[PDB]
Design a protein around this ligand. Sequence first.
Ligand code: SF4
Lengths: 47, 44, 204, 369, 145, 170, 157, 73, 120, 111
Amino acid sequence: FLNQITNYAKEAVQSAKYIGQGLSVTFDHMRRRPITVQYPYEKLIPS
Amino acid sequence: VTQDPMVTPIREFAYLPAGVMSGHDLPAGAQRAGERPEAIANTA
Amino acid sequence: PAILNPIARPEVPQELAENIILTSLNDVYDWARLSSLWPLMYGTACCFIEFAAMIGSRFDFDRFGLVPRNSPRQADLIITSGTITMKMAPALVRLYEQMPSPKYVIAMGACTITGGMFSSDSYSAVRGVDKLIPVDVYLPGCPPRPEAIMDAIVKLRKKIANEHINERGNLAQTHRLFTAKHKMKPVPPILTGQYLNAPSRQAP
Amino acid sequence: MESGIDLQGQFISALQSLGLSHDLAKLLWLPLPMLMMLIVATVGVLVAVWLERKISAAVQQRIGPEYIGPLGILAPLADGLKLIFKEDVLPANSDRWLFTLGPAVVVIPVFLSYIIVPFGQNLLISNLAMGVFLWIALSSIAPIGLLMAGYASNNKYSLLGGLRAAAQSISYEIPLALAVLAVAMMSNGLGTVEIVEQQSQYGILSWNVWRQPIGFLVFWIAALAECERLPFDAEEELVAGYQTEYAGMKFALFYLGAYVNLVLSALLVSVLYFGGWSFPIPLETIANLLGVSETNPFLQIAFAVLGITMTLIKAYFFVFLAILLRWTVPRVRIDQLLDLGWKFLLPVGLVNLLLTAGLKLAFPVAFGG
Amino acid sequence: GLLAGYQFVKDLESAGALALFVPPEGGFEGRYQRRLRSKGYTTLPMSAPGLGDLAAYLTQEHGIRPAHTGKEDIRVYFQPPLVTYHLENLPPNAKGLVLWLIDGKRLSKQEFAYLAQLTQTLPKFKVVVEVGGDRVVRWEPLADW
Amino acid sequence: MDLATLTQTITFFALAAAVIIAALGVVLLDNVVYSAFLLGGVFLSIAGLYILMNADFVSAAQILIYVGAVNVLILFAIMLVNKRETYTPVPGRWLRQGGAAVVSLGVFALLTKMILQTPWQLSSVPPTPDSITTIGQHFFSDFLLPFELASVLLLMALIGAVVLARRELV
Amino acid sequence: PKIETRTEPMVINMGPHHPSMHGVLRLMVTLDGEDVIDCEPVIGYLHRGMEKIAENRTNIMFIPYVSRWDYAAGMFNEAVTVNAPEKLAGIPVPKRASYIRVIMLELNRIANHLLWLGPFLADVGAQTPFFYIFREREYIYDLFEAATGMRFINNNY
Amino acid sequence: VSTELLVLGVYGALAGLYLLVVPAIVYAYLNARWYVASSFERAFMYFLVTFFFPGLLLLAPFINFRPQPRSLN
Amino acid sequence: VFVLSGYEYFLGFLIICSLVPVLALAASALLRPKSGRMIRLTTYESGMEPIGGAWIQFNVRYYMFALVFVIFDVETVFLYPWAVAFHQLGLLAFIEALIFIAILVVALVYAWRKRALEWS
Amino acid sequence: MLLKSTTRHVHIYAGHVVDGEVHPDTETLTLNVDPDNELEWNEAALAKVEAKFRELVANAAGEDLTEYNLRRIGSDLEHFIRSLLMQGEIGYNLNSRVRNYSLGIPRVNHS
Ligand code: SF4
């Protein structure tokens, strides 16, 4: 009865693919321009 | 804030024109959203 | 007396550091404590959310050097970000006393400068955090916007760069220790931790 | 040198030219590679703190610790120096011997394990025939400084945090040992020079990550739970974390020991499962294509710098992968990480050891000798 | 990184009132305040926009009139003149008193001229008004403005 | 004793003094956590002693098991039974302690007599530096039956120590 | 090191210094092995007395006070504090004022759920979009700053 | 010229490159393209900070990466 | 006769790596505030007094995890000389080590099935 | 549970200090006049504050040992310390690191 061994490896490889996908999409966050309003040289105008 | 010669001043969100979310990519002082009440009086 | 709350004349105290090597090491010491400045993750009220708006991405907290700490033992700074009540005041003095000695306080918002809008008709609000703690920089604004908080941090850095390394000794406590015997009756601990297991929730 | 380049031999020969003994010249040579490796570990902890505060900022669309140097380069150094300046606290009935020794016991063997790491062939402190096994044995001393730092504080939630960190830190010693055991099978030894030398034959095809695809994963996940990182570490577990009573240089010892363990574990992923210093093309192939001998001193210098760059490329890549995976993965609580240590990484390490023994017995030319 | 000597105290003793130009990111000019304090001076770091009518606040008595929060009366508090009270409550062999104003911006030219003339008239009193801005810490005398 | 044998003798006497001092601290200390940490000190100095007499795998095994696993288990159980017991001294403490001291000193005097009296058959051939390869050849040779019986010993020890240290709330 | 090890249930404090965005409350829980047996929440570390302050404040000068109860959606507090003398005196509101009120209150509901959502994902273990939630909350802040003058709380709107 | 002296000369040249020259080139590359860089280029320049880090630490108190004063015109 | 090669650096690097926290703490203790005529000595307890008795609960999970660590740590140290001396040993030593590994795999199944690998 | 009243310039700490630890005692309570040195504290006014504190803790006999009564004793001692500072018997420190005048600015007596 190997119904819980293959399910175990399936859960492991689904978590591995989830970690690989989340690692690919957190690597697409570094390419975005930072939204930091750099205060002493970029004082944001009040309304 | 706009008259200090060490600051690049940034309009926050409600003064960025009509499609802009962050005021960092602003090219040269583009205005708030669009027309003002001295325009529809000339339009209609 | 002709001066009501007078200042006092010092004992002519001067370090007179004519050395340029120890002056540069003092510069390194002040720059190192200046550019690290790890604050305590301390909240308690409205102002903390603006403090949290510094830790986010739009205004950057880290780009002056300061990362928030959970324990006060690793905390270099405390930004008192909200109203200090009569219940919160001994807890605040305790978590200030649990910090290492080169520590700095910023009275953030009107609730810690003077107890701003609770300075009139409140019975349980400490009117100013300087009734409890020695304060370095005061920060107005009821919700001071995060540019004002990292302006208070800039003025705190200007304060830190002045500190002399031979002047360590102002970091003392200077015990007085007057002990008196008293005749008050001890009461039991009213708040123990028994809420649902107390034998009054089960039946009227 | 003329015949080659041997700074040990040239130093001992030029120090015997003053009128010293031979053993005294060897004794005066002795602190120099150790001082060089401590310099490498110190620049490694500064690089690790800088990369941690800059890649975490670049993920969250922020700018890192600016205004401390040109970039944030002097940001770790000030974070070192400030912790030298802060006072002691001694939490209210603390042991005052075990309290100061806890950080020392938890960071001394991690520093001592830098004998094992090579930056090139004989570019290390010692070969040490039981190399990676001694690294595992020395890394097993960490949940004694953890329990020492937990006990010697008079408060709870740090004793609880100390027992929690010690139960985490022993749950991943055995999958680490099994994943190193597979490489020690494939390398016929435990010295890291011999471990890299069995991979620096065909450049990139003889690397151990292609022959241990799951052993590399077991070692990487188990080494990311020995360094107290990622999911295996925003309210704390209970209220406190075994170092909430450490203030100045002792918290600095904890803080630098974590990143020194991270840099050492990344270096050992680079050494064990990748080439420790090997270019993806074998170096003697380029030496015979150039026609110049592999013993003349300028090719010696060029190949040594190239091996140092390859070591630092792979160590940087795994430090980068740890700083990415700190913000990639969800933070798991203590029971899920202990189930990952005992119920997942230990059976995968055991079945990896069994299948690599079957592969070495069946196909011995591909897996060692 | 810019090992600064004690030239700053010499420019302070020369000009009497110098305008500082500090980088706006924080504490890179307080090394000069500590150099100035190490030579025997007493620095009095206070914020300039909180002062009003520096002829009255610095050397005159001025009624403060603190905040009654709807409870007390007007209750005028007569603060002593800051420069002369901090100069008389000083050691007699000290080098002098220095007013370290940390916001030289949002002040007028008239107050700058008054601060320079005030440092010129009474003997041991120097101001280091921080008008801010510049990329490095650089100072001018308060002569033209 | 130029520099190498001098360093070996200095290291041997330093580690021997460390074993003796830390083992006395394991016995003769009131705080049991100090004994539980000085036990790891004993094991580390004994591993250095094994390094001195050409046993590097056995020294690494000594660090990995005794420091890494046995001392950690002892510290865990010490924190588990950590209380504030009084330990009132019994009036017959002489009959235990003086008898124990004279028995230990008698066994030490007897063992020192037979150690300094026996003509040990010292070898002149240098030992092998490759210890772990000969130990691995020994495990599937002469020492194969203890190697297989140690697995059954470990399985039984795990079974019994899971059974006896359990709660059976049914 | 006077921490003994008993067999009775312990007590975890979780006191008023919360090292996250959890407010100021004590959470003295017992939790014998892991099961939380009892839980006494201690309340009142921010009790400043708005109910006694209100009896000495005109409604035009209590509107700056009412942002400080639910200080993530501040105008919701004004949405009752204005509506309480509105329905005694029977003062009608315009339709445009009512729609502006609906827009401000629904933006405040979005901002309140965002400030709940940040710490909730940080406590559940996600902890990646904590820094990405404050960006849209800053968008709502800059929307409130144009109309009301201030950000999320101190509106006299 | 002696070949030992030329080996020490290329050692001194490599030390002057690793500590002074290419860290200055890396600093001149980082006030340059940093936002125009991709994710892989950001990883490459973070490697350039990682590898030449003692030279960046030596050159750190002498570079002035502050924004220039504005024109107001 | 001491024939081990590479341990003349191990003793010196142990000495210097033991001195680097000692030198770090001594350089900290030289330049530091010597201060505090009142209570440095307070426990944290999340901002206030020690609440709820100075004890933790007896939980045998700390024993069980260290116990299974002892068992499989002994397993791995037996498996190390089998692993490094594998190229000099045939299929029979692989079968004998397979018997060893299989008995301790049954030990792991026992430690898993009985609730000994649990929460902490 | 340690009973205390910690504000600025007084710390009550119902209990006795041993080495750097205050152990919670029932029938005593300590006093830590100015633990941060905003004031100068010559020995005459220090003895005055000590005598006022002993009078205050004698007049507080028979009440509970709650933190409310300790805070009342500390607040009355705070008002006495501020009255001594206002009379001119106590000066501000001026060697401190903060200098924020937590008990009022200096001011002349009448005008
Ligand atoms: S000052 Fe205003 S925003 Fe800050 S805590 Fe007080 S009431 Fe809230």
